[PDB]
Design a protein around this ligand. Structure first.
Ligand SMILES: CCCCCCCCCCCCCCCC(=O)O
Ligand SMILES: CCCCCCCCCCCCCCCC(=O)O
Ligand SMILES: CCCCCCCCCCCCCCCC(=O)O
Ligand SMILES: CCCCCCCCCCCCCC(=O)O
Ligand SMILES: CCCCCCCCCCCCCC(=O)O
Ligand SMILES: CCCCCCCCCCCCCC(=O)O
Lengths: 251, 279, 59, 238, 279, 60, 59, 279, 238, 59
């Protein structure tokens, strides 16, 4: 059967028994930087198994009135194991990712989720002009919620769901690497993202490589059951990570 | 040595007959992120058709290979305000909506540039207009970042020894030139989801990566007894284009030249009901 | 130093044109608007395991 | 020197010309090239990707996300219409802003076939059959299923496979059609009807939703670039 | 490789002598729809003549290969009425009588096009004309069907990013360009005996198939203290022509630009009687 | 560059000239050709067809 | 890349001219006004059975 | 016979591992006048890097191969003062600061020259400006040292039989020419630490070796009823350049056109203390 | 004659063009060439020569020559900073006017590694050890030696060899950096600390000085010529 | 009499250009801005005895 998948990174394993295929970025698998594309001269460090492993990114509740959530990477892993330490101590970084989203429900539930990775998901403020701090869209592994109505608070991002916070039609996000979680058929989604940027390496604190979004297109529904909510969990594993430019910590 | 010698067409349609089998090309699963590759030949009887249509005009090279206005400004030959006798524009592609939207369909771009300047002049209205003035001449100066900037129409900075410049006389063909790929990175970035300072503070967005320089324009030595106003238009034309990571076209109207800010907009227009099909 | 290549078809169908470069910088050349290669698999078929259209998708 | 004479068109500036020009930065060393993932070489590659179609434009949608879902109910008359729409990918409000309509709106002519993919997002225990039909251009759109079934159609059976594809063939008198479609270049209608009806067991929701995806086939092509009418400005941005 | 190397004459006259036979070349029957192929050699004694006349100038390529005016209009640099400062013409070939009649000798045509623009300016009369104005500049914009249309001389639509345009300065050679065969069908149709709606209703005639777009013209930024009027003339010149199904030339004068409507006309002029042969 | 000098007739517009000019729609794909019946290549072909002559012009 | 072909006769009768194409679109070429083939049978002899001029038409 | 057929890149970085030996590449002695040739590979572990950067734009040919203004002056078509109707400039490169500093980075230079002239005209203000004047024409005359010099606008000396000259009409492209290496010595000298007389007396410095001639300019025969002022700008552009003996760039501002005189200047700017590193 | 048509850019004067032009002195005989010593063919050759860096800019220097010498003392706390500076070769006041900064100020982009050479000019009987460290860009410059030693550094032992070389590697995210450096293209800091302390015998001065030399490596390069902002005039010189 | 030589690289990387001289004086030619040879030893290593980087300088 092709509905079973198993993934082994480092000292951690993921098993799914009811799942769809695996989506691989833009057809490219993660890989190390070549000698003819590098620019930095000093030797890189490659922790390997110490950093390339699955980390569980806390959990959220799917209610009948949920609208959606987003996470920004690699900020979401900024304080997670030795990956966070290497991020803190190094000037430059580079790594691909494997994203696994778990959501399971009985055969009597219904609903559909869109899982999509958006590279360079620049967002606009709630009030045209003005400005917002780096806390309205990234504060660690905590998830940020979209809003059904137009946002009004000037201190946070425009969370109107139907625009995806980017001024574009929410229905066109299918162009990015994506997958669907339809409760009739599957309970997980797997995406492998290569490193995408305009430069060989970049500082992992200053720049958000990509944004993960989970959006319920068909809202959850059920009847006459004791289960009131459907938890959603996100797991991420860096791949082929390497760092450069050791200095004092913090960033 | 003297002469060296240097079509695709869309897929044809194959004849298909009646079928009765266990294969089900029509049934699929979108949950995999896979777009179905079925063709009409797989769901109905079809005749053999030889197509000669080509997708020549849909290439990115042709799509982006059209000159588009990016900036216009006015400057006067003589006036009391010093700042109003010359122009000073920080180069960017976010000023004009149409070309901005054309470009922002991709995340990263790499191309050479062809720049064309269109300059026109007109006499300002007044109570006395009778004068005789010879043909005017204009100078366009390009100052890479960090270079000296002129503060007045007759400053010393206009004596460019290393900054490229063009002198153009009215009545001739518009000025033109070519520019190579002048980015420090491996590609231009239309979007930048990041900050300037390492502690996530300061400027945010594409504004951080715009360091292309300035353009200055003046009348060389024309100073008429009565004011004359000139307008310059700048046109950009990408060449040898390459693009990566397409992204959906924008839906909301633009409101700032250096920000993504917007106002929420409906997904689309409405109709009477889900069955209405008439006009 | 002269390149000879075919020009796009037109109505009524020596379909050859000549080109010479005059400047020392490759950026000065004219647009290369005659390349027509394309491959949509990167966006239409990004899955890992190959899917056969005639077979059922999930199992 | 060499005698010459200028012909009409001298000194003109044509925005779509191809000429060599001097370089303003001689001997400039460009940054080395790097193979970033996801290179796009032709806009048809973008046009061939699926995108969600907002079919439910019922003029009283207080929630914008409700546009994407098509309602379905357990008890309905034996023959009933689920939805109906005009096949004007570049002009109809349904397809206007999709990932395909946006690309088409930059061009004047189009041709080729289209794919409509429908996905059932009900409970795993729900079942039903639907008839999806394409009616070529004519003086009257179908009013009943009896009429609809005379055209191109497919019977969709809901089961383990959640999706079915209606491939709209290219039936036209001309090689190309206008994006700003008029009566001369009409393209027809698409309608969906109940075939058997939706049946559910005890302990399940009484309503379900369907979604539609639109994309182009491998014989699709466009022509005659033009400016899109969707974006405009009144003053210079600052 | 460097150099590749690429007359008909009418039929000669053959010598003919006296004849006395059963063959009757002169007698025929027009009822068959057959045009007789007899020659003078078949009905009288003739000498041998070698003709060198050729029908070179009668080919359709040469017949239709002449530039002809198709439209002219005037627009002013400054005025109170906004609509009078620019032109907007829906492209068609029925406006001018001579080229219209030349074209309508055939039912279907297929050709490339060469378009030339002639622009002239003059100062409007008034009580005070003393002014000094630099050379004017003009823009010609082509908008394929469905594109945005400018509503005023300084609208945003004039910033073409994809619509082709030409900027021309007075005093130079006229503007010119080439256009390919841009019909959706396999050939242009001068006549269309049909309706727009499927139930035989709506528009009737050639008007249904005219969807070629529009042309817009303006002064780029010229706005003189005193009004100035400019006139543009458009000339078409078919190239690489092919024609099918010839039809008789029109007899009645034209009366509508988008209809065949006419007034009945006599077949020809009259004379005193059937035997009158004098002047 | 290459020295040159313009001769009489420069910048003139002669309605019967034959010169190359830039294309305003680069790389445009024309519709495929079709052999419609009744192609005419020379006007003498039309001139060689019979037509009824109105000889009886008797002014009444 | 240069075509050489004869030019029409004139008074006093190197009757050769040279042509080169500069643009990438066949629509930009100059008019091909040197083809002189013609065939009037389509309009003068549209009948099915061949008619001999010397013979009587109807029977 | 017809066709004759005619990159460097910076050094790569080699992989380096841990080391423990008696060799000490880092330790050296500057007292020898020797600049150390160590590379990062010699003091830390490095990866293999293939550089494709080139030093093409740093060559002296490209560094000095830009047109720079060297002189501008004004002259009037008609005036009461005879000396104010024409210009007379002794050729030198010390007038304009930027190109002067670019040149004085080397002690000796040898190159061909390309000279371009930009001329513009404007009408002087006054109580009555209404006139009609045809296009003006200008003459540029070069007089090698020792030749006759004109004393007025209509002198006989302007009838050059051997002095090269250019006649230029307004509205055309700027005038241009080429000049070979015209020095009596084997190279131009920017600096000359010596005297003119053999007993160490007289003129001192570069002023002694400047014997390049003069340039004169006038309106050929234009003499308008009302004054008109014209300005000429001269641009120099070295070609085929060779340079010897580099010297440090100047620090102090220039104060004389024919002397090295200066005012003492601080070495550089100051900061709070030797440890201050913040903005 | 030969038909032709002028394209945009005719009759323009571009200051960086390359065209042939007539000679005003035909058949002029130039003086024979002579091989003067010291020919320079590329400005990087000049940039690769050492020059003294004025590190001691303490805002109260009454004597200009005091700028070039860095003070050192016999008795100091166990860990103490000798000097600190920003690595902005074309913008920082320390490197602004050096032989390398002057060359850089004529260009807009730069890349490659750098050499800093330190020479001890004390008595022959004096001895000591110093730690010289380079800290790549970050949110905070080092405040103590403990922080500094985490980056690239070298321990310098003063002996018969009077000089030591700190080679600053090229660690950057982009191939090139702006000369007018901004926060996006920061380059880091350089600091020097006491490692053991300076010890002297009886009968020697209690203070000593160090000097710094700056130069470029063999992989250095520049790009994008521009006018230098260091020189200006208000009137024509006479 | 025509020289053919390579032109500097550019984005997207017939990289050949043709040149002909029209004037009789070598001073009229265009700039030769394609020579890239260089040798810094004259200014960086002007010492008499060769110094080995790995060895100690003074003795
Ligand atoms: C996101 C857009 C990036 C495209 C890169 C644009 C770089 C601008 C280069 C040309 C700017 C100067 C043009 C004037 C030059 C001249 O007239 O001297
Ligand atoms: C029956 C006549 C059919 C002939 C086809 C005519 C099609 C018109 C094509 C040219 C229209 C636009 C010309 C202006 C183009 C430009 O200036 O940008
Ligand atoms: C230190 C600078 C030395 C450079 C040598 C400059 C020599 C000047 C040569 C040209 C001077 C005359 C130019 C005008 C010639 C003409 O218009 O007739
Ligand atoms: C700067 C180059 C000018 C070239 C002028 C046009 C070409 C003249 C020579 C004829 C073509 C032969 C070219 C070749 O030999 O490769
Ligand atoms: C854009 C093409 C410009 C061609 C310029 C004129 C021809 C110059 C080369 C001489 C003719 C040889 C042509 C060939 O080799 O086919
Ligand atoms: C004064 C010289 C004018 C040259 C005109 C352009 C070249 C025309 C001939 C074609 C190129 C061949 C040159 C050659 O045979 O070396």
């Amino acid at each position: 059967s092709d509905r079973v998948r198993s993934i082994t990174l480092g000292n951690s394993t993921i098993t799914t028994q009811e799942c769809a295929n695996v989506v691989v970025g833009y057809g490219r698998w993660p890989t190390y930087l070549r000698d003819d594309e590098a620019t930095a001269e000093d030797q890189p460090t490659q922790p390997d198994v110490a950093t390339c492993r699955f980390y569980t990114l806390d959990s959220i509740k799917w209610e009948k009135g949920s609208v959606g959530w987003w996470w920004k990477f690699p900020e979401a892993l900024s304080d997670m194991g030795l990956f966070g330490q290497n991020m803190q101590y190094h000037y430059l970084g580079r790594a691909g990712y494997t994203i696994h989203v778990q959501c399971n429900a009985s055969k009597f539930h219904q609903g559909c989720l869109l899982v999509v990775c958006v590279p360079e998901a620049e967002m606009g403020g709630a009030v045209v002009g003005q400005a917002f701090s780096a806390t309205a869209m990234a504060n660690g592994d905590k998830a940020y919620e979209f809003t059904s109505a137009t946002q009004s608070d000037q201190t946070k991002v425009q969370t109107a769901i139907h625009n995806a916070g980017m001024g574009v039609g929410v229905g066109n996000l299918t162009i990015y690497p994506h997958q669907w979680i339809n409760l009739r058929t599957n309970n997980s989604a797997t995406i492998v993202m290569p490193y995408i940027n305009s430069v060989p390496m970049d500082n992992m604190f200053r720049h958000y490589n990509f944004t993960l979004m989970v959006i319920p297109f068909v809202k959850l529904d059920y009847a006459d059951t004791a289960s009131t909510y459907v938890p959603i969990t996100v797991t991420v594993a860096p791949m082929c990570a390497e760092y450069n430019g050791l200095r004092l910590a913090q960033a | 040595d003297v002469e060296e010698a240097i079509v695709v067409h869309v897929a044809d349609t194959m004849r298909s007959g009646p079928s009765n089998s266990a294969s089900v090309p029509a049934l699929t699963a979108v949950e995999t992120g896979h777009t179905s590759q079925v063709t009409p030949s797989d769901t109905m009887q079809t005749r053999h058709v030889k197509n000669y249509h080509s997708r020549s005009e849909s290439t990115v090279e042709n799509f982006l290979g059209r000159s588009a206005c990016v900036y216009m400004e006015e400057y006067k030959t003589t006036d009391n305000d010093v700042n109003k006798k010359f122009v000073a524009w920080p180069i960017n592609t976010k000023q004009m909506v149409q070309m901005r939207r054309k470009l922002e369909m991709f995340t990263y771009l790499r191309f050479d540039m062809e720049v064309t300047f269109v300059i026109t002049s007109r006499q300002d209205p007044g109570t006395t207009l009778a004068q005789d003035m010879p043909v005017l001449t204009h100078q366009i100066m390009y100052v890479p970042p960090g270079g000296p900037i002129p503060a007045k129409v007759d400053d010393y900075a206009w004596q460019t020894s290393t900054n490229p410049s063009i002198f153009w006389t009215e009545g001739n063909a518009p000025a033109r030139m070519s520019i190579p790929f002048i980015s420090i990175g491996n590609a231009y970035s239309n979007f930048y989801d990041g900050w300037s300072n390492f502690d996530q503070r300061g400027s945010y967005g594409y504004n951080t990566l715009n360091n292309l320089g300035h353009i200055y324009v003046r009348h060389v030595s024309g100073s008429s007894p009565h004011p004359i106003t000139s307008t310059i238009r700048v046109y950009f034309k990408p060449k040898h284009t390459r693009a990566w990571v397409p992204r959906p076209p924008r839906l909301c109207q633009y409101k700032k030249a250096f920000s993504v800010d917007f106002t929420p907009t409906p997904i689309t227009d409405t109709r009477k009901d889900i069955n209405t099909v008439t006009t | 130093g002269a390149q000879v290549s075919t020009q796009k078809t037109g109505a009524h169908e020596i379909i050859h044109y000549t080109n010479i470069n005059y400047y020392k910088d490759a950026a000065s050349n004219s647009a290369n608007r005659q390349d027509f290669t394309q491959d949509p698999s990167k966006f239409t078929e990004p899955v890992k395991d190959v899917m056969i259209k005639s077979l059922p998708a999930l199992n | 020197g060499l005698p010459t004479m200028n012909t009409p068109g001298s000194t003109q500036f044509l925005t779509s010309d191809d000429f060599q020009s001097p370089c303003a930065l001689p001997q400039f060393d460009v940054t080395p090239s790097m193979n970033i993932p996801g290179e796009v070489k032709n806009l048809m590659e973008i046009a061939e990707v699926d995108s969600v179609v907002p079919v439910n434009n019922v003029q009283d949608t207080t929630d914008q996300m409700e546009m994407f879902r098509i309602p379905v109910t357990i008890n309905a008359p034996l023959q009933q219409q689920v939805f109906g729409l005009r096949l004007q990918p570049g002009l109809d409000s349904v397809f206007k802003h999709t990932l395909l309509g946006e690309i088409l709106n930059y061009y004047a002519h189009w041709s080729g076939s289209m794919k409509l993919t429908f996905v059932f997002c009900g409970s795993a225990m729900a079942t039903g059959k639907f008839l999806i039909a394409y009616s070529p251009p004519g003086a009257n759109p179908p009013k009943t299923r009896k009429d609809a079934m005379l055209g191109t159609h497919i019977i969709w059976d809901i089961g383990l496979q959640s999706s079915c594809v209606l491939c709209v063939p290219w039936i036209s008198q001309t090689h190309y059609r206008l994006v700003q479609q008029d009566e001369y270049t009409s393209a027809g209608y698409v309608t969906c009807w109940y075939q058997t009806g939706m049946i559910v067991p005890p302990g399940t929701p009484n309503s379900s939703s369907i979604m539609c995806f639109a994309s182009a086939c491998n014989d699709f092509s466009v022509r005659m670039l033009r400016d899109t009418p969707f974006i405009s400005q009144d003053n210079k941005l600052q």
